[PDB]
Every structure is written in structure tokens, then in C-alpha cells.
Design a protein around this ligand. Structure first.
Ligand SMILES: [Br-]
Ligand SMILES: [Br-]
Ligand SMILES: [Br-]
Ligand SMILES: [Br-]
Ligand SMILES: [Br-]
Lengths: 23, 156
């Protein structure tokens, strides 16, 4: 616990990458 | 131009609030605008354009944004400090790139929307979260300067 923040950081990295080729 | 991430984030959150459920500003957004010397208009063209991009990101990922936001808010003990931790875990883990910056902005704005929409969310949560997101986002400053600024980025 302090492990959710690192999950969120994971997701947003993926979405960030996803976006990069998709605009 | 040369506007900070803080001002652009705050202009997006204000713009958003205006566009959402009767368009009034939460007290803390009035405050942040005062204390952040908010020099950018929320109905300015950079802001309106970025609003579109972030709103798209939020829709493409509607459920992830919701889930991630709830896990955060139901588990944090100091919302303030916790915003700074997710920021670092995103950005100092292999540079920043456009999408991560925009995915973060999207996330902060979405978070803000949820707080200001829910009439029963306690003031202090809305307050610390907004302060939390604006302060963390200062970290994008140097890197968006390297790219010519926010207006430039959306110009090309
Ligand atoms: Br204005
Ligand atoms: Br996306
Ligand atoms: Br949505
Ligand atoms: Br708190
Ligand atoms: Br560092």
C-alpha cells in the first residue's frame, strides 16, 4: 500500500505509449 | 506564450468545470487561479484545443481513468504527497514523451472533474488534489521548454 500509485504510473505509461503511434 | 504546465493545467481544469454540470468553479479553482498567478484564459485557443485532446484520451480510456482514480483516492492518506509519487513513477522511468505528458494531463483533469462534480466530496480533498496535481506538473516545465512550449507542441 503505496503500491496503487505505482499501478497508476504503469497504466499511464502504457496509455502514453499507445498514444504515441495513434497521433 | 512560454506558459507553465501549472497555468495550462489550471486553465484546462477551469475550462472543463465551465463545460460540466452547470459550469460553476469550485472554490479551490478560484484560489489556485489567484495563488498560481493564472495568466492564461481558459477559453484561449491552446486551452480549447488541448481540452479536445485530453477529453479524447479520457474517452478512449474511460474505465482505466475511473479505476485508477478511485484506487488512488480511496487509499491515499496525504493526497498532496501522493500526487508527486505517481508523477515521478511516470516520468523519470525512461524520459518523458508527448503521450505520457498528455496522458498525465488527461489524468489530472479527469481527476479534477470527478472531484468537482461529486457534491459530497469534502472540500479538503478537492483542495489538496488540485494543489497536488498543479505542483507535481511543474516537473514537465523543463522538458516542454526543450520542445518550444505547449502552444508550439499543439501547433505541430
Ligand atoms: Br478569461
Ligand atoms: Br489514448
Ligand atoms: Br469518459
Ligand atoms: Br489528505
Ligand atoms: Br530527479
Amino acid at each position: 500500500d503505496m503500491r496503487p500509485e505505482i499501478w497508476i504510473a504503469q497504466e499511464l505509461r502504457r496509455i502514453g505509449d499507445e498514444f504515441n503511434a495513434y497521433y | 506564450m512560454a506558459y507553465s504546465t501549472r497555468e495550462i493545467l489550471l486553465a484546462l481544469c477551469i475550462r472543463d468545470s465551465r463545460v460540466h454540470g452547470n459550469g460553476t468553479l469550485h472554490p479551490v479553482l478560484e484560489l489556485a487561479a489567484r495563488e498560481t498567478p493564472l495568466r492564461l484564459s481558459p477559453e484561449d485557443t491552446v486551452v480549447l484545443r488541448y481540452h479536445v485532446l485530453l477529453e479524447e484520451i479520457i474517452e478512449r480510456n474511460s474505465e482505466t481513468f475511473t479505476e485508477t482514480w478511485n484506487r488512488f483516492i480511496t487509499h491515499t492518506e496525504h493526497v498532496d504527497l501522493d500526487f508527486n509519487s505517481v508523477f515521478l513513477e511516470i516520468f523519470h522511468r525512461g524520459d518523458p514523451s508527448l503521450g505520457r505528458a498528455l496522458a498525465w494531463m488527461a489524468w489530472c483533469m479527469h481527476a479534477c472533474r470527478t472531484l468537482c462534480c461529486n457534491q459530497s466530496t469534502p472540500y479538503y480533498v478537492v483542495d489538496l488534489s488540485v494543489r497536488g496535481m498543479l505542483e507535481a506538473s511543474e516537473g514537465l516545465d523543463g522538458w516542454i521548454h526543450q520542445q518550444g512550449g505547449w502552444s508550439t507542441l499543439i501547433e505541430d
